[model samples]
Target: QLLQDSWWNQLKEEFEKPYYQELREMLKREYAEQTIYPDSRDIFNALHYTSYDDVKVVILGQDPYHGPGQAQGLSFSVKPGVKQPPSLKNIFLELQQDIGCSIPNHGSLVSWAKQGVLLLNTVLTVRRGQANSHKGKGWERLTDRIIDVLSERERPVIFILWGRHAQMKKERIDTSKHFIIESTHPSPFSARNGFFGSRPFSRANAYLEKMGEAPIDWCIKDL
Candidate 1:
């Protein structure tokens, strides 16, 4: 079957329970918000999606696009709500740019959101004005499910654990079956202190290269 059909089947199975009420409610709100924030597909599903196995690299962000008018998830809130950030715009400004140094295909970060990479928040669900990672039973329950999905999949995936919160969340992941990497979170307060050089994309690429998968070619703007 096609990916969306398969996913729709499994996605429904995941939420059909009183036990999963927290997750269920979270998704419902996200869909509702998507009407106002149509771009919020970045937030819906807690992670952006395409073909899971078709994905080569996965950049795990701290959270949703809260506080900024640009609610593109993956921690990317483009400035002014009209323009993509310079870092992001430079890469995805168009299908082609800068003469011979053109971005192959529509290789923007948001395009990556549609394919190539999975842009995810550690804790899938949260309310507006609330930045805290989910805690208590609901958090634990959802995290276990996330880890299970990563574990059983055979594709090469890079879990970009950026920051203490992301690290703490990584502990729940089944690393025995996945390639996970760590770096400081891309908040401005942190990146200048060598975060870019910290090599998030490099490490992720290394894992993919080891598996004979194509490495990521462009940087996703977080800092």
Candidate 2:
């Protein structure tokens, strides 16, 4: 199983438990019937490069895109050449405003992952055209454990939690060891509320540089 190649494999016993076991069976049934975005293979691409130990920043998101031709595992990301979602478009807009970089046409964010940013969606997958369909079906348990594991690390990590849902994990993070940047989500509905002027990209890099780690190139095009 491709699961064996992922960071979750380290905790083999945990996933083998009944809760995750039931979720896996449901996911198998979903993939068999629906046109699920991310094609299953890309489902763990974020952790594929940036392992738990390699992670320096965590950009948390709500869930996978419910539409077709979107949701490539990493939050706010799509496959190469796919149309950018509204939320992702606003994210690029903020990058331009925050760092003066032009928005790239494509939506894939693998470059950020390569630089050790964990582009994690709280819910890793969803049924086609079904928003929040997979919620409470065991994804939260797995993601919570991921956050808990990272919190135990001694090194500094920056967690960029945009929106209330993503921010809910703040209580689990140890602020003494890591940085938390919380703000309104970048979706057009809330960007003006607090996300626009937040300058999270620069702020994250600033903290990373201050900690003597290489700064992440938030710009996706050049990569």
Best by lDDT: 2
What ranges in model 1 sit over 4 Å off? 1-3, 6-11, 22-42, 45-48, 73-108, 124-130, 133-140, 192-194, 219-223
* Model 2 lDDT tens row, 1-223: 4443446655556677899899889989888987766678877766776887789999998889887778778988887767889999999999999999888878888888988899988888888887888889998898888888788887888999999988889999999889999999999999899999899999999998799999988887733
| RMSD of each candidate relative to the true structure | 6.2, 1.8
Q: In terms of TM-score, how similar is model 1 to the real structure?
A: 0.66
Models 1 onward score TM values of 0.66, 0.94
Query: lDDT, candidate 1, residue 52?
Result: 49
Best by TM-score: 2
User: What global local distance difference test value does model 2 have?
Assistant: 0.85
What lDDT is reached at residue 90 by model 2? 95
Tell me the tens digit of each residue's lDDT in model 1 across 181-209: 77665565555453455655556667877
Give the range of the ten consecutive residues with the poorest summed lDDT in model 2.
1-10
